[PDB]
Enzyme design. Sequence first.
Site, mmCIF file in Angstrom:
data_model
loop_
_atom_site.group_PDB
_atom_site.id
_atom_site.type_symbol
_atom_site.label_atom_id
_atom_site.label_comp_id
_atom_site.label_asym_id
_atom_site.label_seq_id
_atom_site.Cartn_x
_atom_site.Cartn_y
_atom_site.Cartn_z
ATOM 1 N N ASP A 52 36.910 46.264 41.238
ATOM 2 C CA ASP A 52 37.692 46.203 42.546
ATOM 3 C C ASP A 52 37.222 45.514 43.198
ATOM 4 O O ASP A 52 35.743 44.080 42.892
ATOM 5 C CB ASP A 52 37.633 47.843 43.340
ATOM 6 C CG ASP A 52 37.717 47.464 45.250
ATOM 7 O OD1 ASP A 52 38.902 47.683 45.323
ATOM 8 O OD2 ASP A 52 36.791 47.090 45.513
ATOM 9 N N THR B 173 37.313 50.678 40.579
ATOM 10 C CA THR B 173 36.012 49.469 39.846
ATOM 11 C C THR B 173 35.540 50.753 38.379
ATOM 12 O O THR B 173 36.052 51.923 38.265
ATOM 13 C CB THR B 173 35.160 50.246 41.202
ATOM 14 O OG1 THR B 173 34.477 49.343 41.384
ATOM 15 C CG2 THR B 173 34.704 52.037 41.070
ATOM 16 N N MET C 179 25.921 45.402 35.857
ATOM 17 C CA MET C 179 25.274 44.212 35.704
ATOM 18 C C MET C 179 24.227 44.486 35.326
ATOM 19 O O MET C 179 23.089 43.461 35.439
ATOM 20 C CB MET C 179 25.326 42.789 36.555
ATOM 21 C CG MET C 179 27.017 42.513 36.883
ATOM 22 S SD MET C 179 26.687 41.710 38.118
ATOM 23 C CE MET C 179 26.648 43.114 39.701
ATOM 24 N N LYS D 234 33.732 32.659 31.732
ATOM 25 C CA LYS D 234 32.418 32.135 31.344
ATOM 26 C C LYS D 234 33.024 31.774 29.749
ATOM 27 O O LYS D 234 34.250 32.172 29.063
ATOM 28 C CB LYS D 234 31.620 33.031 30.558
ATOM 29 C CG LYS D 234 30.932 34.301 31.709
ATOM 30 C CD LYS D 234 30.008 34.831 31.209
ATOM 31 C CE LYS D 234 29.448 36.310 32.031
ATOM 32 N NZ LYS D 234 28.697 37.314 31.637
ATOM 33 N N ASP E 84 39.478 35.681 35.008
ATOM 34 C CA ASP E 84 38.361 35.450 34.480
ATOM 35 C C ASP E 84 38.281 36.336 33.174
ATOM 36 O O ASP E 84 39.470 37.157 33.159
ATOM 37 C CB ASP E 84 36.791 35.100 35.293
ATOM 38 C CG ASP E 84 36.599 36.816 36.908
ATOM 39 O OD1 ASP E 84 37.401 37.660 35.862
ATOM 40 O OD2 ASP E 84 36.613 36.750 37.492
#
Lengths: 451, 449
Positions: free
Chosen positions: B299, B327, B374, B270, B248
Amino acid sequence: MDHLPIFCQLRDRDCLIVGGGDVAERKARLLLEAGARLTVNALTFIPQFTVWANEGMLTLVEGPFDETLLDSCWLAIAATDDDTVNQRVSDAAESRRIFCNVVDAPKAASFIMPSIIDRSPLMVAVSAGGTSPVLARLLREKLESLLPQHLGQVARYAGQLRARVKKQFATMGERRRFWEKFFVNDRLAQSLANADEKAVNATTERLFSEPLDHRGEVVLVGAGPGDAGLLTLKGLQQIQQADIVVYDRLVSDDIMNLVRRDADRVFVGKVPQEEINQILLREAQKGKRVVRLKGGDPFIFGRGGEELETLCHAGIPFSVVPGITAASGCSAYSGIPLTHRDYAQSVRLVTGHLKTGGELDWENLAAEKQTLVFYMGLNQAATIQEKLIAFGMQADMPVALVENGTSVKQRVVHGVLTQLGELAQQVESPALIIVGRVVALRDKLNWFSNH
Amino acid sequence: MDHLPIFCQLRDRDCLIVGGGDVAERKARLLLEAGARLTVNALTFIPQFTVWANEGMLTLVEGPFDETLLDSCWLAIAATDDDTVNQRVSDAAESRRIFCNVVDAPKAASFIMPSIIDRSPLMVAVSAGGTSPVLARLLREKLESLLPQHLGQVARYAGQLRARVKKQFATMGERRRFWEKFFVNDRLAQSLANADEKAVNATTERLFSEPLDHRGEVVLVGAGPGDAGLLTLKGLQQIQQADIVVYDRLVSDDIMNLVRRDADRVFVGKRAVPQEEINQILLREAQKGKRVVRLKGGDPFIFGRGGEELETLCHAGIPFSVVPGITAASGCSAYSGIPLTHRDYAQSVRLVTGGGELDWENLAAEKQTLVFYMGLNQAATIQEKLIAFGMQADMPVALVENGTSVKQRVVHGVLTQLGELAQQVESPALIIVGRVVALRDKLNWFSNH
Ligand SMILES: C[C@@]1(CC(=O)O)c2cc3[nH]c(cc4nc(cc5[nH]c(cc(n2)[C@H]1CCC(=O)O)[C@@](C)(CC(=O)O)[C@@H]5CCC(=O)O)C(CC(=O)O)=C4CCC(=O)O)c(CCC(=O)O)c3CC(=O)O
Ligand SMILES: Nc1ncnc2c1ncn2[C@@H]1O[C@H](CSCC[C@H](N)C(=O)O)[C@@H](O)[C@H]1O
Ligand SMILES: Nc1ncnc2c1ncn2[C@@H]1O[C@H](CSCC[C@H](N)C(=O)O)[C@@H](O)[C@H]1O
Ligand SMILES: [Cl-]
Ligand SMILES: [Cl-]
């Protein structure tokens, strides 16, 4: 190591092949190309051998095996279809301390001949010890595709420049830096492949003219939790070009084997942190390229910040390669994701070993909807259990302890919060404590081992 | 060619090293790993040699070079700092027809030492005939990253399995197709290395049970936050073997450039996609017999929904594994100069996502480093709630946009500026809150944009 690979200079050195068929012919061709002074001793010869002998390229001895033909020899190859004869040859060679190959029996005798990828003067040899001819062929196929056909011209030109590089650069550190630029200049490689001598000379002049950074360097590298496969590509790069590697016991043996083989190694720990800082600073003040190789990630309970905080004022360049932290590796390899669905709003990475008078914020840690990961907490597991219960965590909350996470020796024990103290008795350092509803997912997600 | 490579069996064979310093110690380490019956002869020895000698691993002869020490020797290495000594050793070895190496000397040597990649029984050696020791090292680095750590395990296991392979495969063409699938089965190799006989037996029976063309499995691979150098070695190895790579938008172009050109690619990100559809893609492709790699930003198990993607598989009978990645918190921390912990600044690091709602009194408490994933859209709300639940207004904050990439952007200030600082960045970005943010002025080494 099953075997030690060496590259032998056979020019003008006596070698013996016993046998005279197609197998012997292939080995003889190889030894002739290497410049061996070759004798072939066989009852019968296929025609390729008789012409070689008449045009003076080797000597034929037509008859049974004559072990006195080994007397002046550096290498022997038994290449008959008679295992009795082959064994007589290998026995006579062994008594003379002559390395010997028995072509049809690689587990006998004392050397094997590898498959060769030829980018002369660059060579790559591959072998699985006869255990697996397919794997060797599959590897050879893959290596031939990775190595450009022009690599040999780069190596050839490098050899022609070694004398000039020795004359013009006074230290090995400068010479090494020159070569590391040389071998990755794509324009230079193309010009060599095109025999464009003007272009080769132009880039060469410029490379020799560049001022070389004589400053040291300190790079912190995260080794990850133990599995050498979890080192990053950039971490491998940095340890492969380090002058010196300062490493701790939380760096696995497999990872240390990936260090530049000629690098100096300095062990710390089981040493006070201030002395580690001085080593890194002092070694970089000498112009050396220092790597501080650290378990897990350098900036999560690794004191990595302490090790860099003087370097900027001191004019020492530094950088940081992050690593897989214990939390991430143990999570993945135990089947316990740190987050999942609405199980955990957050992950808490907590130190279980706190300053003398310090106390963890238990009301904060016991809140719902999070995954708690205690580092360095084995000794305090009984207190952790009592405090989390006292500040409201449910008694049946699942817990897991991961010992030597991601290693072939990994062990995982699990239960509920009221067993935490007991469970911690069943493991030793290094171990991680995971507390949270995600521990229950291990039954569905465990893939690495049952131990 | 100018040198012939041979792979010597040194186990319990007498070898001699002359020299007792750092250089000799490196050669001794190599010959010991090969099982040599090693004698080391030197005017003096560094402490590593006495340690080895006390553990019965080799014999030391303290004193000048004595050429009778070569009388039963198969290999010799001259590893002193004295050219006259090294030449005496080389001449003594040559008169005895003993292959001899002089370290840091090209000729007078009857053999030269290559760079070695050890996957015993499998081994690879690289030599440039004396022209290019750095090229040999660079190629060792490349090969070490490409050859899985436990390949030697399957190489050994191949033996006790050739009776079974030929009772089920009579044609030569099929036998190779089996081995090709066998030797790239990294799961089996790890289970062998783990001494996990239950896992070994289960993976073995599947290799014989399923059709030849079926190689069904799912590997979740953490791509890291962007910089392709932060892919793990095992992550590289897995994407190099994939039949199909499902990825993605948060998998960077640099990482996708490492994807084995030829692999089918499925983009699920997206454009202008429900998780269930993604879960089914992995399922369907695995059941068609494909070796599937699901590449995920960062991760897989930290806000990646990796658990959701795997629970689809455990009861469909599809084998899987997980390769963790760097991460965003770790990558941004390293590349911004903001350590997540430091001295007594933080007792814990909190990785937090921006039904439900966040516990603000909890998040506001002292001695933490907060990392919001986020949270860019809620950054104004994060400011208000942290202030209102008692976090100090002067608390340092930073935002890291496209961390670890060549377009990384770091903006920073204090908690009262968080909402306005967040307007200056775009997703993907991390919000870091805590005293550690103040260390960036001492520790930033990466370029800012
Ligand atoms: C001919 C050979 C000796 C033999 O074995 O017979 C040779 C000779 C010399 N090396 C020198 C120096 C360096 N050696 C290395 C590294 C390696 N040297 C190795 C083998 C070889 N070195 C042999 C064949 C090489 C080939 O095949 O092309 C490796 C691969 C194998 C091993 O030794 O274990 C090992 C890497 C192992 C690994 O990491 O995997 C580096 C780079 C670095 O340290 O990173 C440098 C500095 C950079 C530079 O100078 O190029 C010097 C100059 C000394 C001086 O300046 O005075 C000479 C003399 C000369 O020939 O000029
Ligand atoms: N392989 C491993 N398995 C389980 N815990 C580990 C581990 N390696 C490190 N740890 C944990 O890490 C603690 C040391 S503090 C250093 C942690 C490291 N900087 C990292 O990022 O992971 C140990 O006490 C143990 O709790
Ligand atoms: N390169 C990057 N720089 C800053 N933040 C990043 C990032 N890559 C991912 N993120 C963060 O991660 C969020 C997506 S959730 C995916 C997290 C991923 N599994 C990991 O471990 O990092 C983004 O909103 C952003 O906040
Ligand atoms: Cl720390
Ligand atoms: Cl609870």
